[PDB]
Design a binder for this molecule. Structure first.
Ligand SMILES: CC(C)CCC[C@@H](C)[C@H]1CC[C@H]2[C@@H]3CC=C4C[C@@H](OC(=O)CCC(=O)O)CC[C@]4(C)[C@H]3CC[C@]12C
Ligand SMILES: CC(C)CCC[C@@H](C)[C@H]1CC[C@H]2[C@@H]3CC=C4C[C@@H](OC(=O)CCC(=O)O)CC[C@]4(C)[C@H]3CC[C@]12C
Lengths: 411, 411
């Protein structure tokens, strides 16, 4: 009874997803026929339909009798929502001030985007864990339309190389440099906001809808120092050669300690004798993006010449990142089902390390993008698609693993 | 206890899959660095490792005490195995006879391919439903290595445009034309053999490892006539203009009858009051390839000019194919949980229609490939990847739906 309408809402969602994916892919492949303005028209129609549905929800569905995690997904949702609203404000200011020889087309589509980020954030803040009871089949089609729009927006954010190559054409002055800097710096925030919204809307139509801290704090402070140094050097010019080595050597100092600590915690777990499935599949599927991008990096270094200074640091960094993802995944999946104090230090050290490793890969001009090594191997558009597919998924993995390791810490 | 080693075998499989996918994708993108011979070396090492494991299985694992669907997967497995052995024989004869100015490199890699298709078919014929009990963790790593090799072989078969554009370069004489004709005609057989093997190896490490017929026969005979007419015209020259219209008009006659019959069967189902989950996800995931390819076709026609003779037949054919997939899926998913005789006629008519619609899209020069409409819209390599991703999945859907509708027929 429920699963049948669930299937029908899924058919609506898959038809909208595959139609929009055909439009976006025709924008990638056959660029002369399908224009980005047509994709914006389709996504604007779809966004306005989601606006009418969530407005009808907030005004006339949430008032009849319905049925009678919660701290970090909501906070990251408001954070990434605020920064994506700011990103679209930066895009509007980039549209209106420098290039004044335009029509009124490229201002309306980010304005509906601003409105859509705003009221979806307000709607997902309050109405997340509330099992809808009055209008089942309308709510499932509405939520699946919203998920389809978020997936099409994420796909456009992944494969949209248009402004990112347009900005770097002029780079080959008073406020337009501020606007370009802010747009490039804030571009992963919308791409990860789409994934956060997809996760919480999926939850609310699937289930809903029927000593150690001292070293950890030292790691967080040194990570903040190298991150602010790389970001100050990065948004001032084409940054440097040595700051790459500094960032990657911070990675090669931190990540083997996390591998060794995760392996030790796994041995301690061997020395002692629905929600869990969604947590497992979220951890694995979020790990796959960074594992895939780093395997592309491994092949891209060993096919070219290794044994340069930082070029050996990217290789070792990628291999240690794979190994850290794997051992940390084994540690978390084993952890969800003199010893206890040691394991508490392990878990809180990994929590603080995951927080500083969460804040770092979401700020635009990342050093896995800003080398001429994977670029001019796969190419700009291909490596842009790989990086924007992988790095928001690594941010999602860091968030979800912060939650899992905080559950381990109070276990 | 079991799920942990299951996870570890999955880590081995995902590492091999992502490493080989990085090699194949570097062959697509950075063609100057990674050569197809290196992909053949990697797949040959991987194939030989699977050969040693399955030979050790057949000779020294299947003899200790183990634990104490079956008619069409096995038959299609032997059929596609025989035709892929024949395809690799055709590839060897294409390698050795026409282009004699070669080294001994391109003969060994199809020879290990022939041996690998042969003994995997022999191994999957007898040892499919036998729960292995003696060497658990070795068998899981072996089966996951074999699944990783089959997925990498399927990915190379999907994205391997190399010979298919090489053959059509000379087309711009005694036996090399026979060899090229047979290779192009038999190329989907290996690509669908890989998916059949992936499905049965996935089963044997997942669960194992711990009146109406008269019109249906008329449809089958007329489908055989239009298929043999298109194949005789197709492998004689660049075929015709009118045979496309004949094939697509057979589709536009047959598929609305299947939509109407599936909708009627759904209404009759509304008028009466593990394995199932794998069947559902196999039906949906096999449907997604044809639904995606036809949505690409819909966008490719409506972005260019419709309202030509057969160009309106491809559009209506694609929309009716989407609608037939959707209504037949609704019919099968409802069917798995004066009236009974009518529903029996519905099910057997759809069985015979699915058999003739199973034999048709697996024979090479397909009319969804052989128009200059989606080609020169997406391009040869892109549309080749789309067609070889979609059409073996449609063959898999037709097979799996023949099995499901035969279960419905005796229900
Ligand atoms: C990343 C983008 C570019 C592609 C992702 C596509 C998905 C967004 C679509 C395509 C297939 C769709 C699924 C197709 C089938 C179903 C099964 C359906 O489940 C049932 O069949 C319940 C009925 C029953 O169990 O009998 C639930 C919706 C769902 C997952 C759909 C949800 C949305 C999916 C995953
Ligand atoms: C088509 C190609 C290019 C990409 C396909 C990638 C897959 C071949 C890989 C990537 C993710 C891998 C999966 C990652 C995680 C797991 C979960 C694991 O299941 C468990 O976690 C059991 C333990 C538990 O339940 O607690 C089983 C292996 C599996 C499916 C792996 C099997 C192989 C997968 C699907």
């Amino acid at each position: 009874a429920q699963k049948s309408g669930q299937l029908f809402s899924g058919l609506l969602a898959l038809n909208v997803v595959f139609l929009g994916s055909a439009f976006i892919s025709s924008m990638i492949f056959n660029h002369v026929a399908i224009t980005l303005a047509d994709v914006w028209i389709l996504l604007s129609i779809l966004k306005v339909l989601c606006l009418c549905w969530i407005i009808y929800y907030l005004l006339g569905t949430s008032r009849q009798p319905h049925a009678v995690a919660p701290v970090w997904i909501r906070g990251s949702l408001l954070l990434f929502g605020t920064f994506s609203i700011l990103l679209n404000v930066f895009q509007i200011g980039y549209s209106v001030i420098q290039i004044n020889c335009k029509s009124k087309v490229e201002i309306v589509f980010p304005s509906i985007e601003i409105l859509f980020v705003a009221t979806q954030a307000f709607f997902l803040w309050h109405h997340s864990k509330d099992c809808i009871q009055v209008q089942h089949n309308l709510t499932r089609c509405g939520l699946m339309l919203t998920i389809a729009t978020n997936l099409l927006l994420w796909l456009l954010a992944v494969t949209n190389d248009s402004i990112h190559m347009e900005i770097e054409s002029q780079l080959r002055t008073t406020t337009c440099k501020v606007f370009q800097k802010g747009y490039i710096l804030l571009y992963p925030f919308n791409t990860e906001y789409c994934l956060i919204c997809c996760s919480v809307l999926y939850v609310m139509w699937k289930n809903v809808g029927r000593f150690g801290p001292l070293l950890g704090a030292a790691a967080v402070i040194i990570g903040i120092c190298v991150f602010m140094m790389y970001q100050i050097q990065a948004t001032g010019s084409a940054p440097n050669y040595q700051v790459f080595v500094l960032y990657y050597s911070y990675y090669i100092v931190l990540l083997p300690l996390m591998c060794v600590v995760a392996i030790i915690g796994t041995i301690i777990h061997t020395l002692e004798k629905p929600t869990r499935s969604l947590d497992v599949v979220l951890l694995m599927g979020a790990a796959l993006g960074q594992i895939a991008m780093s395997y592309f990096s491994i092949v891209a270094i060993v096919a070219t010449n290794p044994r340069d200074m930082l070029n050996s640091l990217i290789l070792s960094y990628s291999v240690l990142l794979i190994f850290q993802y794997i051992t940390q995944n084994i540690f978390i999946i084993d952890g969800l089902q003199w010893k206890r104090k040691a394991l508490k230090e392990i878990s809180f050290f990994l929590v603080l390390c995951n927080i500083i490793l969460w804040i770092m890969p979401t700020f635009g001009a990342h050093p896995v993008f800003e080398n001429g090594l994977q670029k001019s191997f796969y190419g700009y558009s291909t490596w842009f698609a790989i990086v924007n597919f992988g790095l928001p998924l690594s941010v999602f993995y860091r968030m979800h693993s912060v939650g899992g390791l905080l559950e381990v810490y109070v276990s």
